[PDB]
Amino acid sequence: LRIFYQFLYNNNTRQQTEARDDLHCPWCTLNCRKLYSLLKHLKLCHSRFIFNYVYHPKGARIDVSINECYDGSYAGNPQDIHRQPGFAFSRNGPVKRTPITHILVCRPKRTKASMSEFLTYSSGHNRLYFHSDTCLPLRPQEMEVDSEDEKDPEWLREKTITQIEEFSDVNEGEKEVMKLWNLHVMKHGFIADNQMNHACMLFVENYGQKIIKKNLCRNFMLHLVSMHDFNLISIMSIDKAVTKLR
Amino acid sequence: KEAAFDDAVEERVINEEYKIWKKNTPFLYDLVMTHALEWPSLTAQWLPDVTRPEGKDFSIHRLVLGTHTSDEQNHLVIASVQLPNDDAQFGGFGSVSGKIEIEIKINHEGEVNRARYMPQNPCIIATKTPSSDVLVFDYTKHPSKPDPSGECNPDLRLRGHQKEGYGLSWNPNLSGHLLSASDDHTICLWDISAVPKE
Amino acid sequence: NKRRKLKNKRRRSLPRPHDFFDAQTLDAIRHRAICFNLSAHIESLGKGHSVVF
Amino acid sequence: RPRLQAQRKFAQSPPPATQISDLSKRKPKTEDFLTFLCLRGS
């Protein structure tokens, strides 16, 4: 049976040939004795292409086309791809990586031949993770509890102080206070009103030495006044602050 | 040079070949199980005991693995595996969560050069180390949670060798009888069948 | 599932998986093969599967 | 118009269905392409 081929190029053009010494692989010269087995060996081994069974009356015809995706990419430690060159594929020292597990063959069917027919999951991390802010790779150890996120972003602390300094109609004996406080506010994230008592407590508990070294306690008390005025302090603690102060 | 270029080429070729073999596997095996460990191993031993829970499609087995890490703490490990024990069953084949799990970790000084369980007692195993001696352990006497400190009870190490080695064999008929073989050009034989004063 | 449908997964345009082989490792193969054949002449004489001497 | 014109980067501005040998025709295309018969499969 004379066998023929046809080489498609997205229909912009093409080329056609004919198999000589057929039933032997046009690439690996593998002697398949059936159109069945030959079609199998072709659509599996020489997989980087695609095929189709046409059955020209002369015995066999196969119009071939290129594979479209053919996801062939390195299958190893997915990290080596980015090692600065000369070190990649070192293959000369044990290296640690994340654990994974796959399954491919579980229970076969074992059917029979049928020419009419001719016409795998994961468990674990399977990719390369990146740093949130620099787009760089992520070592398998760096991906530990370090979570590169918390409530206080540096740039924010800077921005707020600066914005405060825009104000003209304020004394340094006030701006310094407002900043020293708002920063500590950010540092812990106070929400509930039942916290405000403990709040001013811890505040001086930290900034004791400074306000003394600042000699700024008197405006601190003015602030305590304001805050009680806003119904969050009781008089039963305002003094108590100046007490704990010394 | 040349060898570098050549090795790059060879690597790419091997990659291609593995791609092909994977594409071709389904018509070839009755089971395919692959799993990646963090650090490689140098040992292999199937525990001679098996349990098969009912109402399911799979057995359960325990494996004896070693560890040769780069620099960090070494460990002796034994883990679990859920082999399908069925002919009609096939998420994947059984449960969806996991088919493999670690269960036994023990601190270890140096890498593992060899490890075999004693035929008379599977709870008894041996160990070849980068050192010039032998270590024995019984896992049932140590918690799976490893000593965060590090080195622990050597559990009756041995003596009589001067360089490391790899030979290891209990006598099947006679308990305690165990052979060794190291770079010392020698074969050393202990008999721990009875060592009260360890 | 214990038994689902056959292998089906497709959309408009999935990302391209960035094939591995490079021209730089490709051309060496070509060159090597050329001088090999001109030492061997198999595509001409050995039909790709038999070696001349 | 001047404050309305977008700025610009650049200026204004086979017949013979012979055989498999087409393969052996393709990979050597210089420096003694053997078999001397592949040129017909140009």
Binding site: F7, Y9, N12, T13, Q15, W27, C28, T29, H46, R48, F49, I66 | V13, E16, E17 | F21, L26, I29, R30, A33, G48, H49 | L23, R26, K27
Partner: peptide
């Protein structure tokens, strides 16, 4: 239609299997 496109494209996969042919044969 610079047919070198059709050429260059199908050029690539060929040599690979070609090498692979010999390799596997041995």
């Amino acid at each position: 239609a610079d047919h070198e496109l059709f050429l260059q494209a199908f050029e690539k996969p060929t040599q690979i299997y070609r090498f692979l042919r010999t390799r596997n044969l041995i």
